[PDB]
Amino acid sequence: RPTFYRQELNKTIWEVPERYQNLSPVGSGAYGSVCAAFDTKTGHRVAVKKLSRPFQSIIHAKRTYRELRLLKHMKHENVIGLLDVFTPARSLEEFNDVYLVTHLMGADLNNIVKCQKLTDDHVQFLIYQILRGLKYIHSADIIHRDLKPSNLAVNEDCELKILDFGLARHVATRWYRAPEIMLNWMHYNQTVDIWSVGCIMAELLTGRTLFPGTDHIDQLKLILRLVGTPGAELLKKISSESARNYIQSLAQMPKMNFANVFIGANPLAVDLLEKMLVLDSDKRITAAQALAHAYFAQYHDPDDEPVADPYDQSFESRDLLIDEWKSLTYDEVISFVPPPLDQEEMES
Ligand SMILES: CNC(=O)c1cc(-n2ncc3cc(Nc4c(F)cccc4Cl)c(CN4CCC4)cc32)cs1
Ligand SMILES: CCCCCCCCO[C@@H]1O[C@H](CO)[C@@H](O)[C@H](O)[C@H]1O
Numbered sequence: 001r002p003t004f005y006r007q008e009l010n011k012t013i014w015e016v017p018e019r020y021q022n023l024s025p026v027g028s029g030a031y032g033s034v035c036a037a038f039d040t041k042t043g044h045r046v047a048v049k050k051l052s053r054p055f056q057s058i059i060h061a062k063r064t065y066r067e068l069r070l071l072k073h074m075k076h077e078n079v080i081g082l083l084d085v086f087t088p089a090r091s092l093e094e095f096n097d098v099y100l101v102t103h104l105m106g107a108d109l110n111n112i113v114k115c116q117k118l119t120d121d122h123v124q125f126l127i128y129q130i131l132r133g134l135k136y137i138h139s140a141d142i143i144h145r146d147l148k149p150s151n152l153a154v155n156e157d158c159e160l161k162i163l164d165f166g167l168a169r170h171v172a173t174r175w176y177r178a179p180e181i182m183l184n185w186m187h188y189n190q191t192v193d194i195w196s197v198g199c200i201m202a203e204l205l206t207g208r209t210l211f212p213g214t215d216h217i218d219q220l221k222l223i224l225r226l227v228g229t230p231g232a233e234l235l236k237k238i239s240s241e242s243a244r245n246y247i248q249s250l251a252q253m254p255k256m257n258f259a260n261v262f263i264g265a266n267p268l269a270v271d272l273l274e275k276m277l278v279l280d281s282d283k284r285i286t287a288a289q290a291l292a293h294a295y296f297a298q299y300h301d302p303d304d305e306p307v308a309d310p311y312d313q314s315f316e317s318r319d320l321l322i323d324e325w326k327s328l329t330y331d332e333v334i335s336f337v338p339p340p341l342d343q344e345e346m347e348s
């Protein structure tokens, strides 16, 4: 067991192994508390996330287990990978905090979008990499659920990683969220993530948020103005007569012509966006289909877009006691095996 030291940053206490020095706080949210650190064992900068109140409630305890299981599974160039998982506790009964470590990236997509206007090549490469990571995530029967610029980060070569996963099942921007999530549809397609990609793509091309709603209903208002009020084929799938009546009571809006909306963009980029930002989730393009779209011809390689090992999420169906979720999480902390050093990191 490494020696731990304690330090307080922005009013939160960090207990970490000595190997991690120069802690500086990247951010703080109800989702988690994050700092940057220098890993004196590898010579690289790391991002360290502390889980808050991990076992305070059955919901939090299950959510703690869910995130560690997810992150332990992710082994893909364009998805966050775990370099270390640790707790200062030396016993399961002392166990009450969880820390997660990954490579510190250079900037997120909010700062890229504010720092520069992006060329079409840049947009191709960034969206290509999101879709490559997404193909892998969806191949494990996982939905990310919270793709957004702050959850996407790049290095100096514009190599991209998808970061924190959406942990809600059954403070937090709505701007990239698929309408059916906001409307409690309750059965979600993996294409909720494709909606988010489309919103992100649009913003990379224009530099402007596509749907910056002020609140829940404003978000839906802005969405319907672009893609139009639901069509007959979609209305067929809505059981509630009052919901249908409400929809038909709105001013009927046609879907706008994306070619006019995104005037000046690569016509192939506009075609892909039309295939992504479809109201009916059943009609949206999949990650695998999108990777074969002509917009990515310069980057697509069918033999280097790998898929995930099967992911056992039978736990999502379980109703267990708080102490059980805690014990399962502890077991996963103890069993964690760090990835090997990259070959490039070593010499002769
Ligand atoms: C100079 N560099 C910068 O300014 C930046 C680089 C970062 N960066 N890099 C990697 C990274 C990872 C996470 N999360 C995380 C973690 F920290 C440890 C283990 C597992 C996970 Cl998922 C977050 C936090 N989430 C919340 C919104 C992003 C930010 C991250 C972002 S900006
Ligand atoms: C009041 C206007 C709100 C319109 C929201 C669309 C209603 C979607 O509502 C959903 O319909 C599904 C299919 O019938 C059901 O399976 C889900 O339980 C229901 O939430």
Ligand SMILES: CCCCCCCCO[C@@H]1O[C@H](CO)[C@@H](O)[C@H](O)[C@H]1O
Residues within 6 Å of the ligand: 179, 180, 183, 185, 186, 187, 188, 189, 224, 230, 234, 237, 247, 279, 280, 281, 282
């Ligand atoms: C006015 C509100 C517009 C909301 C329309 C969103 C329609 C999303 O699409 C729907 O997604 C559901 C999965 O969640 C599927 O079960 C339905 O088959 C599909 O039509």
